[PDB]
């Protein structure tokens, strides 16, 4: 009863789905059943920044940043699956957490 | 009736009528009524003389009118004589608890005095 949990975090959804698709494709090639990827709710943070150097309270820029999360489950893992997962490259801008 | 030297309203509930006495609020009235077992919705006009005497006995336990006013006056006079910061504010008839005075001190300063 060994299950592998993969969590992906990023600031760029196109990157995060590219990485998730690559991981899923590799796992399917190795010969293990996978579940996902499952999109978790996105986090959004906003800021209001005054633009003028001295006094204009109504002159502000509104910025935002988003955090995207993906969840992937691997069930019935073959022996080659794990070593393939550490052989898999790490792309900048996407953070990966693996739990056994 | 007359309680503690005060004519409380006759056609009101007891818990509301007892608040007409200085030094007694809603919480104190509730506590007094619960200590003599009279329902809060009963008006004082359907109260027996014995119940009124019991209420008078309960009321005398707390400071109500003359002692309370005397003690407040003494407390203020002590500060004014000692000359601390609060005493000076009491002397000048200005806000005492750190409020702004550039505007909005009308309760302590009375109506506006033209220049």
């Amino acid at each position: 009863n060994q299950r592998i949990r993969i969590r992906l975090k990023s600031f760029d959804h196109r990157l995060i789905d590219q990485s998730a698709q690559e991981i899923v494709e590799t796992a399917k090639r190795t010969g293990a059943q996978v579940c996902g990827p499952i999109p978790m709710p996105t986090r959004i943070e906003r800021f209001n920044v005054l633009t003028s150097p001295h006094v204009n309270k109504d002159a502000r820029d509104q910025y935002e940043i988003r955090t995207y999360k993906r969840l992937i489950d691997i069930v019935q893992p073959t022996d080659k699956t794990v070593d393939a997962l550490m052989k898999l490259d790490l792309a900048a801008g996407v953070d990966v957490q693996i739990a056994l | 009736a007359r309680i503690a030297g005060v004519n409380i309203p006759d056609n009101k509930h007891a818990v509301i009528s007892l608040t007409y006495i200085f030094g007694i609020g809603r919480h104190t009235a509730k506590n007094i009524l619960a200590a003599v077992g009279i329902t809060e919705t009963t008006k004082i006009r359907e109260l027996d003389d014995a119940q009124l005497d019991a209420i008078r006995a309960e009321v005398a336990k707390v400071p109500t009118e003359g002692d309370l006013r005397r003690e407040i006056s003494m407390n203020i006079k002590r500060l004014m004589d000692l000359g601390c910061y609060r005493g000076l504010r009491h002397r000048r008839s200005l806000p005492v608890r750190g409020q702004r005075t550039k505007t909005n001190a009308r309760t302590r300063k009375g109506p506006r005095k033209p220049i």
């Binding site: - | 002590r78 000692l82 000359g83 601390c84 910061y85 609060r86 000076l88």
Partner: protein, 82 residues
Amino acid sequence: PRSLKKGPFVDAHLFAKVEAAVASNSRKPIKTWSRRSMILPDFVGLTISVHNGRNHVPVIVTEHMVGHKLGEFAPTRTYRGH
């Protein structure tokens, strides 16, 4: 006000001075800048020169003053009228 579980607050350098005076009996005013120190029962009968931002004003401690801050008897602003 300061929580009762912590006790009153007195500056150590002022506490040492008053304790030394009371162990002795010197009537010399104690010069201090500690407007925030609490007046204790040991303070009664002493003269303390409290700073008020510009000068040191003398205060003679009586029984009625116990429980107050030293700064309440040294006003910092000057006002006489408009």
